[PDB]
Amino acid sequence: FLKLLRLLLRRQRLARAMDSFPGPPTHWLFGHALEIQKTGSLDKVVTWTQQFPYAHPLWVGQFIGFLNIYEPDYAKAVYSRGDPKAPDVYDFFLQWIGKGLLVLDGPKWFQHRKLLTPGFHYDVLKPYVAIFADSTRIMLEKWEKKACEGKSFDIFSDVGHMALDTLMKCTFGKGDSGLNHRDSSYYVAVSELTLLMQQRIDSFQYHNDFIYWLTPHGRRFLRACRAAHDHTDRVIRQRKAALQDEKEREKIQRHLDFLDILLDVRGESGVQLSDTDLRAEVDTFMFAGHDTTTSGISWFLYCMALYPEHQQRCREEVREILGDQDSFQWEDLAKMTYLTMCMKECFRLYPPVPQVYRQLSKPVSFVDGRSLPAGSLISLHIYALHRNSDVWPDPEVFDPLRFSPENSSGRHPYAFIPFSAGPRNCIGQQFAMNEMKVVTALCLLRFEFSVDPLRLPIKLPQLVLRSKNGIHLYLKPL
Numbered sequence: 001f002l003k004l005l006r007l008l009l010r011r012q013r014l015a016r017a018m019d020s021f022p023g024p025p026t027h028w029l030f031g032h033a034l035e036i037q038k039t040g041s042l043d044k045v046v047t048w049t050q051q052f053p054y055a056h057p058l059w060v061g062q063f064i065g066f067l068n069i070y071e072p073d074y075a076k077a078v079y080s081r082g083d084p085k086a087p088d089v090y091d092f093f094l095q096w097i098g099k100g101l102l103v104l105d106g107p108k109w110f111q112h113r114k115l116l117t118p119g120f121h122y123d124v125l126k127p128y129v130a131i132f133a134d135s136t137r138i139m140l141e142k143w144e145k146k147a148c149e150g151k152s153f154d155i156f157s158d159v160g161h162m163a164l165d166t167l168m169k170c171t172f173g174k175g176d177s178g179l180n181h182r183d184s185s186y187y188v189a190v191s192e193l194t195l196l197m198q199q200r201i202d203s204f205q206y207h208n209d210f211i212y213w214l215t216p217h218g219r220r221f222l223r224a225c226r227a228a229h230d231h232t233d234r235v236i237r238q239r240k241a242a243l244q245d246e247k248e249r250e251k252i253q254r255h256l257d258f259l260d261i262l263l264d265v266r267g268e269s270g271v272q273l274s275d276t277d278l279r280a281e282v283d284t285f286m287f288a289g290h291d292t293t294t295s296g297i298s299w300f301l302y303c304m305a306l307y308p309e310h311q312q313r314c315r316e317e318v319r320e321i322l323g324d325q326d327s328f329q330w331e332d333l334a335k336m337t338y339l340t341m342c343m344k345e346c347f348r349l350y351p352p353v354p355q356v357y358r359q360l361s362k363p364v365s366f367v368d369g370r371s372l373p374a375g376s377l378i379s380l381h382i383y384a385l386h387r388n389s390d391v392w393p394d395p396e397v398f399d400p401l402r403f404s405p406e407n408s409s410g411r412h413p414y415a416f417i418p419f420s421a422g423p424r425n426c427i428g429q430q431f432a433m434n435e436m437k438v439v440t441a442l443c444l445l446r447f448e449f450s451v452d453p454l455r456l457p458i459k460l461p462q463l464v465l466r467s468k469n470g471i472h473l474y475l476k477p478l
């Protein structure tokens with residue numbers, strides 16, 4: 001009883017705050033869940049976006065109500081203020097990545113953010129360029145054999161194994177050994193975790209913790225959680241043991257990679273992390289550092305396939321930059337200006353993270369006079385934001401030149417936020433951008449990509465942006 005009364009009072013509170021915001025009709029039980037759970041609901045939200053300027057309410061089951069926002073001023077008003085993440089959504093992370101940097105709020109988040117930000121300084125990243133090329137070459141060898149077999153194949157999983165391996169070699173001290181059967185067990189568990197958690201987000205019956213853990217869904221989730229934790233436990237043990245080597249420990253001790261910072265080599269961290277805190281940050285970054293870039297690369301190579309003229313331009317840019325070099329140098333990534341424009345245009349139409357959430361700790365007033373109070377829930381729809389017609393002429397049209405120096409000089413700084421923005425932006429953005437430029441550059445020099453008209457990708461939200469049917473492409477070796 002006590003709890004049910006509070007539940008209805010919040011229900012009425014959240015609803016009243018959004019009364020100045022008209023929105024689509026709500027089912028009496030599911031709210032908007034039934035539209036959201038359909039294939040294509042990202043595009044149905046885009047249509048709601050045209051019917052309701054700026055923002056519109058959004059309900060999952062008549063108890064939780066978000067304000068879906070999709071206009072730059074509205075995005076800027078919230079995502080510049082470092083309000084906490086929406087606990088109704090991010091609490092589902094807890095059995096999986098825990099209270100790591102993505103879930104933390106408040107001054108503990110800033111401590112860890114201060115702690116981990118040196119791990120992604122460009123001097124730490126320069127050596128990673130060589131690792132990116134090695135791991136890509138391993139993937140491209142597999143691909144030259146499949147290609148000569150004549151059938152189209154899904155590239156997503158191969159890109160993921162490659163991304164996972166390159167993430168661990170770069171930021172977790174993995175040695176030259178490479179992928180092992182156990183690494184694929186981790187990869188498969190993330191699929192299950194992001195599948196199930198995305199469905200929990202859209203399924204209000206699964207919201208209550210007590211109930212969820214009794215369902216087959218929740219038990220499946222907790223089996224996957226343990227599988228992920230077995231992986232991160234080994235990676236941690238392995239690096240503590242490897243630092244017991246005299247040669248190795250002397251060597252590490254100017255700039256430290258991600259996992260060594262956490263392990264507080266050289267004592268300089270100035271913060272003491274619990275084992276819980278440590279594993280949560282490893283869980284968090286092991287996930288965020290490969291799931292996202294897998295989506296980005298895979299969707300990019302799809303966009304290059306859809307648009308061979310752009311693909312050929314990118315192929316010629318990177319070919320001139322490489323010359324007779326054995327491999328690209330960190331300095332070369334800046335010259336890939338046109339590849340970067342296509343990559344941004346890809347992320348506009350195919351954002352690797354299409355939706356994020358906040359819970360306002362303070363009120364906010366928007367550019368049109370409407371406002372919201374503290375305690376309300378914000379749903380940043382990056383997908384619709386990037387297709388906003390008031391901001392992007394011909395939104396569905398792929399045009400890399402949208403991101404030329406001239407055409408972006410007066411860009412609203414919150415129009416194109418695939419890595420978010422404000423204090424809770426992506427810590428890994430330049431790690432990711434660098435990885436993806438090196439991988440896709442080598443991909444284009446080695447293969448020419450075309451789509452499969454029989455198996456065109458369908459967009460599938462899954463925390464990051466996946467495909468219902470993979471990304472099946474045809475490859476020509478060169």
Ligand code: HEM
Nearest residue numbers: 101102288289292293296352353356420425426427428432
């Ligand atoms: C294509 C690449 C990437 C995309 C699209 C992406 C997207 C995002 C987004 C949208 C956020 C905000 C989270 C929210 O609003 O809830 C974010 C934050 C973050 N990303 Fe990424 N990310 C990328 C690459 C990376 C990489 C490479 C790593 C790890 C090495 C990573 C780790 C994280 C973490 C830990 C945060 C939280 C930072 C904080 O709260 O201070 N991301 N990312």
Ligand SMILES: CCCCCCCC
Nearest residue numbers: 288292353355356463
């Ligand atoms: C609720 C969706 C958030 C996904 C964040 C992923 C961070 C890279």
